RNA sequence: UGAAAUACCACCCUGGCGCGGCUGGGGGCCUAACCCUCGGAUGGGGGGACAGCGCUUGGCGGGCAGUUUGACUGGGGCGGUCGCCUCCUAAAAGGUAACGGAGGCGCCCAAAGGUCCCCUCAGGCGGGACGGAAAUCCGCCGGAGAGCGCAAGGGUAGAAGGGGGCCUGACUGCGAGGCCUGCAAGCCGAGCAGGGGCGAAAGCCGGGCCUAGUGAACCGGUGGUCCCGUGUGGAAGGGCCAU
RNA sequence: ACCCGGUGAAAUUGAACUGGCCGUGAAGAUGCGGCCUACCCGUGGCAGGACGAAAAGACCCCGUGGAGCUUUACUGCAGCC
RNA sequence: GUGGAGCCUGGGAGUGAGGGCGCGAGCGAUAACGUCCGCGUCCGAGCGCGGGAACAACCGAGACCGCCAGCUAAGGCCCCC
RNA sequence: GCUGGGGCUAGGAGUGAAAAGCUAACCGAGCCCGGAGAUAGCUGGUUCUCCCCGAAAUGACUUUAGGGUCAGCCUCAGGCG
RNA sequence: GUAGGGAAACCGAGUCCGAACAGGGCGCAGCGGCCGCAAAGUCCGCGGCCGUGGACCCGAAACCGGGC
RNA sequence: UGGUUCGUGGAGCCAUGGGGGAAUCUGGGCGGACCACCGCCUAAGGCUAAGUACUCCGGGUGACCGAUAGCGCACCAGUAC
RNA sequence: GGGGGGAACCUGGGGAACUGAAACAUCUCAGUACCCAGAGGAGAGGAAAGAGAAAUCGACUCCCUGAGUAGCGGCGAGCGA
């Protein structure tokens, strides 16, 4: 992790709870990450969006 | 006079029914982002203190 | 006639001016609090609502006060060093020291990750416009001397290397059994369940060929949870999950 | 100073029946080994040794010891604004 | 393999300045009664005993007590002996 | 200039033609009593007898290095065999 | 002491994590012929050691208060 | 600011140095920020035995000392110095 | 009427430091030591603007307990209703 390589949270797009924490290079991947992850509250897979940490 | 209970131990630890000493696992207080789900999950549990350190701590818990 | 339409009186706007209420700054002056002084003192003179002093705000402040000012070390100082990875020293298990010999890390990758499918290097000889030692092309030889992001070692083409498609397992809830080990840590992990990815399938997938890329508590922030709530309902504030 | 008559201390002192050499030994031995030298006991003297006496090294280092001092070390206080 | 062997649980420690030697290395200079590890040993704690002239750790040997008894070890047998 | 008598100023304070000088024979902070049996991870000292067993000077971590905590190694009790 | 588990509400021979009736953590179970005997536990004596006190004894240089 | 277990904490209560400044039962304080409900209690005047503390003094008693002990002092001692 | 004295004991007004935190500043030692004012044979406190959940108790003081609980705490050492 550095200034360019940030830590970030993944928020379930449906119920809105952050379920995952990961990292990206916001110069290499300047867009908000969108990732299908398992959400344990919805208890199904859902698109997760990068949300500020 | 009478021994005083140590309150550092009292807030971190418990004497089990058979006299073991159980603490929360360490190392998920922060810096968790790059730690695998395996790391966070197994760190979310209690563990049994090794016998040398446990007997020391129970001596600090004279009235439990 | 426009969106609204006119004489007439309200209530209220806009912004401006005057008499004011009540204050906020400046300015001049007054005396009587307060201070200084005067043979004379229930007074006169000067200062004057300042100064002084009370509470409170921020600042300057070795004048004083309490202290702190690391360790290793062929004495101490000075210099060097302090965690982590690789090799050697290391006496063919493991481990093993010196201010012994040599290098690296404090990152990175949205693919450089999962899976399915295909592919195979470096190099040397010969041949081919611009074109060379080396760009691209063709043939022959060529087990790995190439490659695997970065040090070194191990490993490796019967791929961990190169290319493509679909993807997000860079899972959630756990976890038999181990490695290592003073503790605390650190490491590997089949298997079961949830909901998925790829594959016809057998299956694989809980990041990355591997070993560095890191930081126990305490205190606090943030999202969620809806567990506690100081007579009761809430609320304040905590707890738990995540970061 | 020395001798006689008078009075009469001191630090120090494990005990001592306390020699030389060459060695050995915690690395400089009267005390151990080998050899050598040596009858017993004093008095006046000299200071080489008893690592002689004195002072629990001031130098030096070590102690998460102290104290004086300094400053753009930290944090306070007085005083001043 | 029955040994002051081993294992489990608990009470009490002390030690965390080691040192010589042999061998295997690093450091040093194929120096040091040098230094730093490894395997071993002895002194430490066996400054008890014999030998090595004397001498913690080299050779011999693990001292319960007593004997004017015997056998040995290393080392010795010309005299001190 | 020196000196008698009579007075005043003191402990973070006095006084100092300045040496940290002097303040009742040792002043970089007087003396007395009190806090007080300050604290001393340091040095010293630690008292009858017999019997059994019997270490360590290592590893890890340490403002740690001549001190600690845990492990190793000793010992006692119960158990296993 | 007779109940534990859980941060807690709470449940209870279980409980916590979890969606789980899954898996796991921490928990739950005397001898002889009604008697004896033994025992959880607990009380008192004794002893080793630990905590708090100066805590085995002697020793600072210093710090502070009040006086001289 | 202090006091309390409460060290700024969600910080109430009790006390008050400063500023502002009420009401008289339809008044007021409290029940841990706050608000509502519910309940407790009557501030800004004073006094009040006993149970409690201590031991100069007197007495009684010791698995207390017995002249280096026990008070500093058994004695002409807070003396001699 | 007061003044001054009294071994401790008591209340009020002031109020340290060593030490402990294995350094140190918040914290601790401790509202202790000490100074001062006053009381008396005791002093203090005392008759709810209390407690705190008991649908309750019923001044104060003092002992046991509650309890090393609740909490407070560089959530450290420790402090402690
Ligand atoms: Mg604590
Ligand atoms: Mg943790
Ligand atoms: Mg942490
Ligand atoms: Mg957390
Ligand atoms: Mg947090
Ligand atoms: Mg990772
Ligand atoms: Mg993971
Ligand atoms: Mg994750
Ligand atoms: Mg979880
Ligand atoms: Mg209890
Ligand atoms: Mg209990
Ligand atoms: Mg004027
Ligand atoms: Mg005037
Ligand atoms: Mg005038
Ligand atoms: Mg004027
Ligand atoms: Mg003014
Ligand atoms: Mg103000
Ligand atoms: Mg100020
Ligand atoms: Mg300053
Ligand atoms: Mg200073
Ligand atoms: Mg101090
Ligand atoms: Mg420091
Ligand atoms: Mg330091
Ligand atoms: Mg040091
Ligand atoms: Mg040093
Ligand atoms: Mg050294
Ligand atoms: Mg050295
Ligand atoms: Mg040297
Ligand atoms: Mg040396
Ligand atoms: Mg040197
Ligand atoms: Mg240096
Ligand atoms: Mg390093
Ligand atoms: Mg090796
Ligand atoms: Mg090795
Ligand atoms: Mg090896
Ligand atoms: Mg080997
Ligand atoms: Mg091993
Ligand atoms: Mg070095
Ligand atoms: Mg480097
Ligand atoms: Mg791609
Ligand atoms: Mg790959
Ligand atoms: Mg080629
Ligand atoms: Mg060519
Ligand atoms: Mg060419
Ligand atoms: Mg050409
Ligand atoms: Mg290669
Ligand atoms: Mg490189
Ligand atoms: Mg692919
Ligand atoms: Mg698809
Ligand atoms: Mg395991
Ligand atoms: Mg382990
Ligand atoms: Mg690691
Ligand atoms: Mg890690
Ligand atoms: Mg599945
Ligand atoms: Mg599936
Ligand atoms: Mg599947
Ligand atoms: Mg399919
Ligand atoms: Mg798996
Ligand atoms: Mg890789
Ligand atoms: Mg990597
Ligand atoms: Mg802390
Ligand atoms: Mg917190
Ligand atoms: Mg919350
Ligand atoms: Mg409530
Ligand atoms: Mg609730
Ligand atoms: Mg309330
Ligand atoms: Mg309501
Ligand atoms: Mg409720
Ligand atoms: Mg609400
Ligand atoms: Mg809440
Ligand atoms: Mg829950
Ligand atoms: Mg978490
Ligand atoms: Mg004569
Ligand atoms: Mg004469
Ligand atoms: Mg003699
Ligand atoms: Mg003689
Ligand atoms: Mg010699
Ligand atoms: Mg000699
Ligand atoms: Mg001689
Ligand atoms: Mg002799
Ligand atoms: Mg001899
Ligand atoms: Mg001799
Ligand atoms: Mg001789
Ligand atoms: Mg002789
Ligand atoms: Mg001779
Ligand atoms: Mg003579
Ligand atoms: Mg002489
Ligand atoms: Mg002479
Ligand atoms: Mg001499
Ligand atoms: Mg001599
Ligand atoms: Mg001499
Ligand atoms: Mg001497
Ligand atoms: Mg002298
Ligand atoms: Mg001395
Ligand atoms: Mg000395
Ligand atoms: Mg010295
Ligand atoms: Mg001296
Ligand atoms: Mg010096
Ligand atoms: Mg030195
Ligand atoms: Mg020093
Ligand atoms: Mg230090
Ligand atoms: Mg130290
Ligand atoms: Mg110091
Ligand atoms: Mg100082
Ligand atoms: Mg001083
Ligand atoms: Mg001035
Ligand atoms: Mg046996
Ligand atoms: Mg044995
Ligand atoms: Mg044992
Ligand atoms: Mg014992
Ligand atoms: Mg014992
Ligand atoms: Mg030791
Ligand atoms: Mg020890
Ligand atoms: Mg040590
Ligand atoms: Mg050592
Ligand atoms: Mg040594
Ligand atoms: Mg050494
Ligand atoms: Mg050694
Ligand atoms: Mg040894
Ligand atoms: Mg050797
Ligand atoms: Mg040989
Ligand atoms: Mg050798
Ligand atoms: Mg050799
Ligand atoms: Mg070597
Ligand atoms: Mg040596
Ligand atoms: Mg040598
Ligand atoms: Mg050598
Ligand atoms: Mg050795
Ligand atoms: Mg020794
Ligand atoms: Mg021997
Ligand atoms: Mg032996
Ligand atoms: Mg010997
Ligand atoms: Mg001896
Ligand atoms: Mg011998
Ligand atoms: Mg001999
Ligand atoms: Mg001989
Ligand atoms: Mg010898
Ligand atoms: Mg020797
Ligand atoms: Mg011997
Ligand atoms: Mg024997
Ligand atoms: Mg014979
Ligand atoms: Mg022979
Ligand atoms: Mg011979
Ligand atoms: Mg003969
Ligand atoms: Mg004159
Ligand atoms: Mg005069
Ligand atoms: Mg005079
Ligand atoms: Mg005069
Ligand atoms: Mg004066
Ligand atoms: Mg003066
Ligand atoms: Mg004075
Ligand atoms: Mg002074
Ligand atoms: Mg003074
Ligand atoms: Mg000063
Ligand atoms: Mg003068
Ligand atoms: Mg005097
Ligand atoms: Mg003088
Ligand atoms: Mg001083
Ligand atoms: Mg001073
Ligand atoms: Mg003097
Ligand atoms: Mg006094
Ligand atoms: Mg004290
Ligand atoms: Mg003392
Ligand atoms: Mg000290
Ligand atoms: Mg033995
Ligand atoms: Mg060691
Ligand atoms: Mg450690
Ligand atoms: Mg360290
Ligand atoms: Mg170290
Ligand atoms: Mg030390
Ligand atoms: Mg130990
Ligand atoms: Mg053993
Ligand atoms: Mg043994
Ligand atoms: Mg046994
Ligand atoms: Mg519980
Ligand atoms: Mg279970
Ligand atoms: Mg019993
Ligand atoms: Mg113990
Ligand atoms: Mg003491
Ligand atoms: Mg004490
Ligand atoms: Mg004591
Ligand atoms: Mg003790
Ligand atoms: Mg002095
Ligand atoms: Mg001080
Ligand atoms: Mg000081
Ligand atoms: Mg001072
Ligand atoms: Mg004074
Ligand atoms: Mg207030
Ligand atoms: Mg307070
Ligand atoms: Mg407060
Ligand atoms: Mg708080
Ligand atoms: Mg409060
Ligand atoms: Mg209120
Ligand atoms: Mg006020
Ligand atoms: Mg108030
Ligand atoms: Mg009312
Ligand atoms: Mg009202
Ligand atoms: Mg009130
Ligand atoms: Mg109330
Ligand atoms: Mg009401
Ligand atoms: Mg009330
Ligand atoms: Mg009264
Ligand atoms: Mg009465
Ligand atoms: Mg009375
Ligand atoms: Mg009474
Ligand atoms: Mg009485
Ligand atoms: Mg009496
Ligand atoms: Mg008698
Ligand atoms: Mg007598
Ligand atoms: Mg006497
Ligand atoms: Mg007598
Ligand atoms: Mg008397
Ligand atoms: Mg007399
Ligand atoms: Mg008076
Ligand atoms: Mg009176
Ligand atoms: Mg008071
Ligand atoms: Mg007063
Ligand atoms: Mg006060
Ligand atoms: Mg007082
Ligand atoms: Mg003071
Ligand atoms: Mg202090
Ligand atoms: Mg102290
Ligand atoms: Mg302490
Ligand atoms: Mg203390
Ligand atoms: Mg300290
Ligand atoms: Mg300390
Ligand atoms: Mg200090
Ligand atoms: Mg302090
Ligand atoms: Mg205090
Ligand atoms: Mg007193
Ligand atoms: Mg009086
Ligand atoms: Mg009475
Ligand atoms: Mg009264
Ligand atoms: Mg009344
Ligand atoms: Mg209780
Ligand atoms: Mg206190
Ligand atoms: Mg109480
Ligand atoms: Zn969701």
From Swiss-Prot, chain A:
Keywords: Ribonucleoprotein, Ribosomal protein, RNA-binding, rRNA-binding, tRNA-binding. It comes from the Bacteria. One of its GO terms (molecular function) is structural constituent of ribosome. Signal peptide: none annotated. One of its GO terms (biological process) is translation. Gene3D superfamilies: Ribosomal protein L33. Belongs to the bacterial ribosomal protein bL33 family. Part of the 50S ribosomal subunit. This is Large ribosomal subunit protein bL33. It comes from Thermus thermophilus (strain ATCC 27634 / DSM 579 / HB8). The gene is rpmG.
Swiss-Prot record, chain B:
The keyword Signal does not apply. GO terms for molecular function: structural constituent of ribosome. Keywords: Ribonucleoprotein, Ribosomal protein. GO terms for biological process: translation. The keyword Translocase does not apply. InterPro entries: Ribosomal_bL35, Ribosomal_bL35-like, Ribosomal_bL35_CS, Ribosomal_bL35_sf. Gene3D superfamilies: 4.10.410.60. GO terms for cellular component: cytosolic large ribosomal subunit. It comes from the Bacteria. Pfam families: Ribosomal_L35p. Part of the 50S ribosomal subunit. Belongs to the bacterial ribosomal protein bL35 family. This is Large ribosomal subunit protein bL35. The lineage of its organism: Bacteria, Thermotogati, Deinococcota, Deinococci, Thermales.
């Amino acid at each position: 992790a550095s200034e360019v390589r940030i830590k970030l949270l993944l928020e379930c797009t449906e119920c809105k709870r952050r379920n995952y924490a990961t990292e990206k290079n916001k110069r290499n991947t300047p867009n908000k990450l969108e990732l299908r992850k398992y959400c344990p509250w919805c208890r199904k897979h859902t698109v997760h969006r990068e949300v500020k940490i | 006079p009478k021994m005083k209970t140590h309150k550092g131990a009292k807030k971190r630890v418990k004497i089990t029914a058979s006299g073991k000493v159980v603490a929360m696992k360490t190392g998920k207080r922060h810096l968790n982002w790059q730690k695998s789900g395996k790391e966070i999950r197994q760190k979310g549990r209690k563990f049994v203190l090794a016998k040398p350190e446990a007997e020391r701590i129970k001596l600090l818990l004279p009235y439990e």
